[PDB]
Each structure stands twice: as C-alpha cells, then as structure tokens.
Amino acid sequence: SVLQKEGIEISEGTGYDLSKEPGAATVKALEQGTIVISYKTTSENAIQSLLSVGNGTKGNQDRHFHLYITNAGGVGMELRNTDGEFKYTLDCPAAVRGRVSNTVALKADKENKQYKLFANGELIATLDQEAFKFISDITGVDNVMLGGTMRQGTVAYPFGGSIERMQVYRDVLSDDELIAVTGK
Amino acid sequence: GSVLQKEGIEISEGTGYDLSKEPGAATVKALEQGTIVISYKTTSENAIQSLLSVGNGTKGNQDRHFHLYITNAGGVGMELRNTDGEFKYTLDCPAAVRERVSNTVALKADKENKQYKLFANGELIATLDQEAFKFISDITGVDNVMLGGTMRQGTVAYPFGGSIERMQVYRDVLSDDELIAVTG
C-alpha cells in the first residue's frame, strides 16, 4: 500500500484528515489503483464518504473523488472534475447490510479503462468509460481524508463510526484478490 | 420493430412533448429491457436535457424516473431512479458529441447480461454492469412518457430545446453492431 490506516474512529461531521501523512502526495496523483476499506457505520446520514481525495477550495466543490456508503446498505463512488469534464459514478443498492463490519473495494484499471466495485466478497458493479479518468485528472487536488469530502472547506458527506482498515494501492489488484480481501 | 416511434418533433425549451397517450406508451412504461435510439439537434444551453423520459410525475416521486439525456457540454447520459434507497443508476459520458449539428445516440439495457451500453455517432462510449439489474418496470408508479424533459412533481425538469429528429424505442435488445451502424 502507498497509504494505510487502521482503527480510526470518526465522529459524524468531523472527518479525519490524512493530507499531511507520508503517502498522501502519491494518493493525490493516482492515475489508477485500488482502495480497500473495512468499516462500521454508526451514522444515519444518507451519503457517507469513507475515503475522499479532492480539491477543497472555494468554487471547486465538484472536483473530487470519493468512495462512499449510504444509510440504506448502498456502496458507491463518484469521480468528478466539474460536470463538463467528467462525472463518473457507481452507486449500488443493498450491497451491504442496511452495527456490523463490512469491507468494500474499488479498482480503477487504466489499461482496461474500467472501474470495479466490490463488497463483502462480491463484484457488484463494473464501469467502462471510453475516456478513462482518475485522481490525477482532477484539477487542484489538495486533500485526502477519511469520513467525508471537503467541499469549499466544509466536511460534506459525513461518516460516523469506525474506519477499521483503509489501504490505498498504486497497483491494480486482481478481481480474485479483491473477492478474497473483501470477504471475512 | 419499434414499440414507439416519433419523427420531426420540435420542442421549445421547457415545453416538452407528451407521448403518454400514444399507442405503445404503455409498453414503454413497463420495459424490463430494451433499446432507445434518438437523433436530435439541441439549441438549448441547459446543463441537463432529457431527450426521452419515462417516470412518475406525481408529487413526492421526483426521484422515480428514467431518462436518456444530453448536456450543454457535448455530453450524453442516462439516469434510472426509484428513490436513492432503491436505485440510482447513472451513466454520464463527457465530450461524446460535438453551425449546430445533428447527433445520434442510443441506450441499450440488456437484462440477460445485466448491462447498460451507451452509443453516440457510431461509437460505444460506456458500459455499466450492475449486479442488481433494474429497468423501467422496476420504477414505482410510472405514469408518463415524454420527449424533451422529465416530469418531476408536475414540472418539466431537465428541459430540452431544439429538434427530436427521430426517436425509436424497442423492447428488443439490439446488437452492438446494429447500434454502431444506426448511430453512425
């Protein structure tokens, strides 16, 4: 992993800044890679970012990436650099249990121009875009955080609970590894 | 054969064009899968312009609809929604289309293969695979079909302006080669 955290408890609304951590610079420029997160939510917020990487400055609220969960057992991601540039999304319903640990992962595979989302030992969605993008295509990325997404200096999409384990890889893990690692 | 077809329809921005009473509309309102092919010319700067929508126009049901849309930045996309707790499937492709010019786009929703594919001007531009495949028949309380907008609580949302030159809806799932040919 280029960045890893474990056992991080987050109060709803606060987030947990990773922007100064060794490895954060690498995460802020990812051209592809893999993100694996085990978590337990205690929040009823409708959209809860587990990990985000983006531009937190004024007027750049549509320039970010996040991997998120919902209050209805959903898992998704959005990858955005304003709608005119790109708004790539995956949103999967009823993928996890709607006080229970879950493990999710996102793979972004530049060679295949594919994004794959996994939850609890299952591939739940795949996206192929003619114009592949990732974090390095977002303009002005300046922050990495757990448990929310910075939008004009405000913590948006606020998570509450535990980030049990978070790992970010520059490498693109195989579908078998991700089935295995997102299992029990 | 198409189950619903219209040609040479002008629409001023905000007006829409109701198809709800047309023979074939009932079939469109219950599609479990199918194919939509549309040639159009937009004259509107609206950011999101529905070419064709099928949904629930009643109050409180503004997140229960399907539409195939274009943007003011050369984008093409679709959203398929039955409130966020149930499903919100979005495929949004930037810079897919380009004196104003005519463009031809298509969406294929393939139940057997649990896939959605979007085409523009002779090219496959995106593919979405979802473990929980959904289509129009999964939306609750569908009561209308229209060109040039989406009914949300009795208001024309996502308003298109310009010409719907040719619009066809099929219950059949056309081949990728057919769609490359008909859109190009």
Author numbering:
A (entry chain B): 8 to 105, 111 to 196
B (entry chain A): 7 to 104, 110 to 195
Publication text:
RgCBM40 displays the canonical CBM40 β-sandwich fold and broad specificity towards sialoglycans with millimolar binding affinity towards α2,3- or α2,6-sialyllactose. RgCBM40 binds to mucus produced by goblet cells and to purified mucins, providing direct evidence for a CBM40 as a novel bacterial mucus adhesin.
RgCBM40 crystallised as a dimer, adopting the canonical CBM40 β-sandwich fold with six antiparallel strands on the convex face and five on the concave face (for data collection and refinement statistics). Electron density was observed for all RgCBM40 residues present in the construct (50–237). The sialic acid binding site is on the concave face at the dimer interface, however, size exclusion chromatography with multi angle light scattering (SEC-MALS) indicated that the full-length protein, RgNanH, is monomeric in solution. The SEC-MALS predicted molecular weight was 73 kDa, indicating that RgNanH is monomeric in solution. The macromolecular architecture of RgCBM40 is conserved among members of the CBM40 family, with the exception of Vibrio cholerae CBM40_NanH (VcCBM40_NanH) which is proposed to be part of a separate CBM40 subfamily. No significant conformational changes were observed in the binding site upon ligand binding.
